[PDB]
């Protein structure tokens, strides 16, 4: 086949004759020239399946160079001295999540001799905590609605997700509420617990576990409302819940929360590379706590001593 002498050996175009040791057009000539001169290493994301022809040759430079080199072109033939040499947003915005957290929790503090509520009594810690929980379930759904894309989900799936995550949601909530007090936690009803009371109630183990692994770390890393809301969003969307219509959507939204949170971390706190990873690592500690609390909730409910309200009963039943 001596007709191939009149064509380019790479892109299959009409050539000018030999240049780098193979017959190629001015395009591949200038390309190999400009490439080998600086010898810049290309990166092709396909990968490596690219078929180079006359028309599309400029779309992928990597595979074009590889085909040029495969045809027998020499880098030594090239003159001039040289050889070898953010966020993802508005789908799941953190501002709306922040708006949700600010909406649900009015309580904050700024720069003397004031604060909203901290009365106390060590009777009865469990009953008061259940009361506060039942109180905060309504604000939990009201929080859930303000979270992006959740209201767009089917109603039954919303129900399932809330019934699944309500415990860890409330837990993270009162943990971050109690971030300013040690120890221990402030109830949403305003009343105080004081872990001694938890020890005298026999629940001291899980309580001190909450004190150690949640509020302590949150205060140490100084977690704000955005990150709290994002973590609560990760907890909120669980693709692994039972009875889900389309778990892939929930998982996808969760991924969106990952990207958005990591973005907010790479923005607000450029100082700490391990901020995002820390926030994520607070989650497995939460799950073990959230489950252990259900075991006590299933207990005190079955015993029939501590009065349980209707909504909390519904969540437990």
């Amino acid at each position: 086949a001596s007709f191939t002498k009149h064509i380019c050996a790479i892109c299959g175009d009409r050539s000018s004759g030999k240049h780098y040791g193979v017959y190629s057009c001015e395009g591949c000539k200038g390309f190999f020239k400009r490439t080998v001169r600086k010898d810049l290493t290309y990166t092709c994301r396909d990968n490596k399946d690219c078929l180079i022809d006359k028309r599309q040759r400029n779309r992928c430079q990597y595979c074009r160079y590889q085909k040029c080199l495969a045809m027998g072109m020499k880098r030594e033939a090239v003159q001039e001295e040289r050889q070898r040499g953010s966020s993802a947003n508005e789908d799941m915005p953190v501002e709306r999540i922040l708006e949700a957290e600010l909406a649900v929790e009015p309580k904050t503090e700024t720069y003397e001799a004031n604060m909203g509520l901290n009365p106390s009594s060590p009777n009865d810690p469990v009953t008061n905590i259940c009361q506060a929980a039942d109180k905060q379930l309504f604000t939990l759904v009201e929080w859930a609605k303000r979270i992006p894309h959740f209201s767009e989900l089917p109603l039954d799936d919303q129900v399932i997700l809330l019934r699944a995550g309500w415990n860890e949601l409330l837990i993270a909530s009162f943990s971050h509420r109690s971030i300013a007090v040690k120890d221990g936690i402030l109830l949403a009803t305003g009343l105080h617990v004081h872990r001694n009371s938890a020890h005298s109630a026999g629940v001291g183990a899980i309580f001190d576990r909450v004190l150690t692994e949640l509020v302590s770390k949150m205060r140490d890393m100084q977690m704000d409302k955005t990150e709290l809301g994002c973590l609560r969003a990760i907890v909120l969307f669980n693709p692994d819940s039972k009875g889900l219509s389309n778990p892939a959507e929930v998982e996808a939204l969760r991924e969106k929360v990952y990207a958005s949170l990591e973005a907010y971390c790479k923005h607000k706190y450029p100082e700490q590379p391990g901020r995002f990873a820390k926030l994520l690592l607070r989650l497995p500690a939460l799950r073990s706590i959230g489950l252990k609390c259900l075991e006590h909730l299933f207990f005190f409910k079955l015993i029939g001593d501590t009065p349980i309200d209707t909504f909390l009963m519904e969540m437990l039943e």
Partner: peptide
């Protein structure tokens, strides 16, 4: 069973 559905409705 009942409450949560109605709260989620409106």
């Amino acid at each position: 069973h009942k409450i949560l559905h109605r709260l989620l409705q409106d």
